[PDB]
């Protein structure tokens, strides 16, 4: 029974509490080398009186693995258990140590989940699910205030636009075209850095306690927030808590004071002088940009600064959370203390961090709420855009990570597809609105929180940091309405139902060398089913469904598809952005 | 290449910092289905300039797994990497996601260790290694003070001794026969609960701020500590931070105040009345002993109490650390806050917790320092005592857990073999001093911290809670000196060298159906090699060694063994407590 394949580790995604009484148990094995697997758990005290095999079910299957669900509510908020791992009539149960052949006599050597402590519990702001993001770079979005700088005016490029120079994007602008996003139909907004910096990208933080003069001030921000919290839209601010722009005071001190500097440890010293030239930054910097030293996040005073900082805005601006510019490099400790803080200021505060890699570490309810689900992103794009991965692969990538994280966090994943740090979805494809649409959809079709990089609903071809961050197009003329409409529809659609929000998620087609996808989601009222066609063109499908429901109404066109045979016939024009529910 | 076997998870034991610059990388695979495996790491920025394959080496092999070492010092306190996983001429490197076939182009999809933050770092009190414990139950050890209680006098039993009634063991007593342990040759001492309780086992804590009146007071304790810290011996106190004896004030309130009680949440309410009778404890208790309610470790006030409590004694008694009666059931959070505290009071404080199961969770440098290495214990006993497991199995059990934990924690494992919670080593065997000796040895032969349950150096046959906790034998007559001598020797021996302390640890014999063991440890000065024979009797061995050294001097008898052939001949009387170094 391909024994050397199974795995089960306490915590992370392989054992965690969803609530303060129920618990989930995950277990992995070879693709289909596992007839069944029951969860044998109970209380570590009166064992022979609390044991109940919990039929673990297959929830996901990546390339070479089978994962298993299992809903357990320990009679006494505590559980010791093993696993069954069954095949044919062959049985072998897993213990904390080896693989027994006869039912474990003493619960002593069995896995164990100490006690359900409603505190340690992971409780990310559930309002994210209902919510639907929309990212925005303050620098080049809107400028409702003529007082900014001397450099470059609004838009100019088309294919090769936006240089790493300047533009006058302000907050007021956002306050202006706010009713515009209101038109777009947003739920929340993520703001890139907007703290007294000295560059277009405000990641060169001079003061963690002030809004760049050009941008505005607290009020402007607040006045901006207030209408948001009025239009029912949360708000997020960038937390450059790792590196500080060369400007940042404590740094200057060290520079213009070398050794004797009283802020010697506020960062990381390597060489007496603060020289670099061509050699190497004599101090731990971001990547290798001297104008960005890494803060000694472990340093006491440094802590408070950033701490009171984080809470500050939350406290006074009343923002809706912090995005962590780059967290996968800042003390996990500060991260700990961080939450507690941003919680005692606003429990519902959303702690999003920038982690492009597997981050089950920070998602232990001990540090973050969510992260940049690049892994997810790395799938869609790797499927719809680059179209190098097939269907199964997609479902496969939506397994290694589908299970990789716990039930909750997963449901609150900041699943985007593009940002200021990378290229734009559109160009990723290439004016293939069709190809794009099918992706953007999956985004607003999967669970967790989706994010819309400003300018796209309208249609914008970006590139990398300079390109991607292309100026906004405020001339109604340039307005891919059929694209904006696409969005709105997709948006409200993401709202119109809950299954798409956080419903189930099966699949009825992925067969290897294929490009046609179909999956299912549902609650106890409405059951919808989405289908997409990547084919360079048309392609018809065939697949079975259930009866409990009543019919199959074409969503968008509000048309109606019939079950027909014991299988529903579904046609795809070429890039079937076609999906529907089932009365 | 049996692909579905490999595993690598960030943190825990599969990725951690040993110091603030060097890092270890573990990787598992099938027993011998892995020619080699190199660690491909570097910096996630200037990749093509910092990459260096680190030859991961085989450090341990359980039943069906191969684990790999790898010493890495990221040029810039940060590392992104993958793995090589090689066999024959067949190569396939592991990434954060899939198993590539061609060298990974972009470090983007590679594993990553954020940044080496010397704070998050795991730094358990290194003085434990050099140190050698010795557990002691205050209740029935020594009574240098005639004022205790009305019940039972000193020892009485032999085979069926010590009932769950009473005896007058005091602290003063310890202060008396202290020079006795001084004779025994101890380094540290773990004290079971000794806080105002109402039972022989002080786990029925009435006040976390006082020493049971019978026992004594702070001074007595201090006066006891002072001579210890004078005889160069640390001290540990039991932390009943999960449940409180029925006596405990806040409880009484809830009992004699039902609902209206102001301490309603200080614990866990389930039923308005505090009844139980035969039904079930209307409140979350230890196991199912109403006279022990579980403290709402999450409760604010509750925190401080225990908090200031923990630090209190450390602060004033100046103890050397806390053992956690039962931690695998107390909020992991409190555990967090706990450390920070017991650290700002005494950094070198030792946070030992009672976790009988795999606890890599608490050993993340985020909560504990060490635990009750029952897994280890579960091996030795399962080998030397019960003698149901062979040699390899032993080495095998010393693999699933040898790697299970990080390099450091492992080196600081409270590796005992018996305590008040279980039976005694001796009886576990049965007057077979021989069989015992060989075990006790491995204990003082493996790495981490060993622990001597009081009374044993002299020879005491215990049982379970009532038995095991048999009164102490202070009549010089009953004195298995050849056994005590065994200890002393073994003790000083554990001191006489460092290899045994924390040296390497290979093996030169384990062959399946066998009971003869031999392993190696060493530093850059002395190389020793231990061998043991479980055979019901005699048994001679044959095995190779190295030349770098100079010879092979029989330790105990200070006799001398010769390399002879390219292999050394070694004779075992029946239970060869024989071990030696090699000039």
Swiss-Prot record, chains A, B:
Temperature dependence per UniProt: Optimum temperature is 50 degrees Celsius for hydrolysis of beta-cyclodextrin. It is elevated from 40 to 50 degrees Celsius by addition of Ca(2+), and the thermal activity is retained more than 80% at 60 degrees Celsius in the presence of Ca(2+). The optimum temperature is between 40-50 degrees Celsius for hydrolysis of soluble starch, and it is 50 degrees Celsius for hydrolysis of pullulan.
Tree of life domain: Bacteria
Keywords, ordered alphabetically: Calcium, Carbohydrate metabolism, Glycosidase, Hydrolase, Metal-binding
GO biological process, one term: pullulan catabolic process
Residue sites binding substrate per the record: 243, 323, 420-421, 465, 469
Pfam families according to UniProt: Alpha-amylase, Alpha-amylase_N, Malt_amylase_C
Residue stretches spanning the membrane: none
Residues with site note (Transition state stabilizer): 421
Similarity comment: Belongs to the glycosyl hydrolase 13 family.
Subunit: Monomer. Depending on the pH of the solution, exists as a monomer, a homodimer or as an assembly of six homodimers forming a dodecamer, which is catalytically the most efficient form of the enzyme.
Function recorded in the entry: Hydrolyzes alpha-, beta- and gamma-cyclodextrins and the resulting linear maltodextrins, with the highest activity with beta-cyclodextrin (cyclomaltoheptaose). Soluble starch is hydrolyzed slowly, but it is nevertheless preferred over pullulan as a substrate. Is able to hydrolyze amylose and amylopectin, with a very strong preference for amylose, with maltose and glucose as the main products. Maltose and glucose are the main hydrolysis products of cyclomaltodextrins, maltodextrins and starch, whereas panose is the main hydrolysis product of pullulan.
Name of the protein in question: Cyclomaltodextrinase
Naturally occurring in which organism (per UniProt): Bacillus sp
Upper classification of the organism: Bacteria, Bacillati, Bacillota, Bacilli, Bacillales
């Amino acid at each position: 029974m391909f024994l050397e394949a199974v795995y089960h580790r306490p915590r992370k995604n392989f054992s965690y509490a969803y609530n303060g009484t129920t618990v989930h148990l995950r277990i992995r094995t070879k693709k289909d080398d596992m007839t069944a697997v029951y969860a044998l758990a109970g209380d570590k005290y009166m064992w022979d009186h609390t044991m109940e095999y919990v039929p673990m079910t297959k929830l996901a299957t990546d390339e070479l693995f089978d994962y298993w669900e299992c809903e357990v509510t320990p009679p006494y908020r505590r559980v010791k258990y093993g696993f069954l791992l069954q095949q044919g009539h062959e049985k072998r149960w897993m213990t904390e140590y080896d693989f027994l052949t006869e039912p474990p006599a003493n619960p002593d050597r069995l896995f164990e989940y100490p006690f359900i402590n409603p505190v340690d519990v992971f409780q990310p702001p559930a309002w994210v699910k209902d919510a639907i993001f929309y990212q925005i770079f303050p620098e080049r979005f809107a400028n409702g205030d003529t007082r900014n700088d001397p450099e470059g005016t609004l838009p100019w490029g088309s294919a090769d636009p936006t240089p790493s120079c300047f533009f006058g994007g302000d907050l007021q602008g956002v306050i202006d075209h706010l009713d515009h996003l209101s038109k777009l139909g947003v739920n929340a907004v993520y703001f890139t850095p907007l703290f007294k910096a000295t560059t277009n990208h405000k990641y060169d933080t001079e003061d963690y306690f002030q809004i760049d003069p050009q941008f505005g001030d607290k009020d402007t921000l607040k006045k901006l927030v207030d209408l948001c919290h009025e239009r029912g839209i949360r708000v997020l601010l960038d937390a450059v808590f790792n590196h500080s722009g060369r400007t940042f005071p404590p740094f200057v001190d060290v520079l213009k004071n070398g050794e004797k500097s009283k802020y010697k440890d506020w960062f990381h010293i390597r060489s007496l002088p603060l020289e670099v030239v061509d050699g190497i930054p004599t101090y731990d910097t971001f990547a290798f940009e001297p104008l960005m030293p890494k803060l000694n996040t472990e340093h006491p005073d440094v802590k408070e600064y950033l701490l009171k900082a984080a809470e500050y805005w939350i406290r006074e601006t009343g923002i809706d959370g912090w995005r962590l510019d780059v967290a996968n490099e800042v003390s996990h400790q500060f991260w700990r203390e961080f939450r507690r803080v941003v919680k005692q200021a606003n429990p519902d505060a959303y702690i999003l961090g920038e982690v492009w890699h597997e981050s089950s570490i920070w998602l232990e309810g001990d540090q973050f709420d969510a992260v940049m689900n690049y892994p997810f992103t790395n799938a869609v794009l790797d499927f719809f855009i680059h179209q190098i991965a097939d269907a199964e692969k997609f479902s496969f990538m939506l397994g290694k990570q589908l299970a990789g994280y716990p039930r909750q966090a997963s449901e609150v994943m900041f699943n985007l597809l593009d940002s200021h740090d990378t290229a734009r979805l559109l160009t990723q494809a290439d004016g293939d609105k069709r190809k794009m649409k099918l992706a953007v959809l999956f985004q607003f079709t999967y669970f967790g929180t989706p994010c819309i990089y400003y300018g796209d609903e309208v249609g914008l071809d970006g590139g990398h940091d300079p390109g991607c961050r292309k100026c906004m197009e405020w001339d109604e003329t340039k307005h891919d309405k059929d694209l904006f409409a696409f969005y709105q529809t997709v948006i409200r659609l993401r709202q119109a139902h809950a299954a798409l929000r956080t419903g189930t998620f099966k699949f009825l087609t992925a067969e290897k060398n294929s490009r046609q996808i179909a999956y299912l989601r549902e609650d106890d009222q409405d059951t919808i089913l989405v289908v997409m066609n990547n084919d360079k063109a048309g392609h018809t499908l065939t697949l079975p469904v259930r009866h409990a429901q009543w019919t199959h109404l074409w969503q968008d066109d509000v048309l109606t598809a019939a079950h027909g045979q014991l299988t529903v016939k579904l046609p795809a024009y070429g890039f079937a952005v076609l999906k529907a529910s089932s009365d």
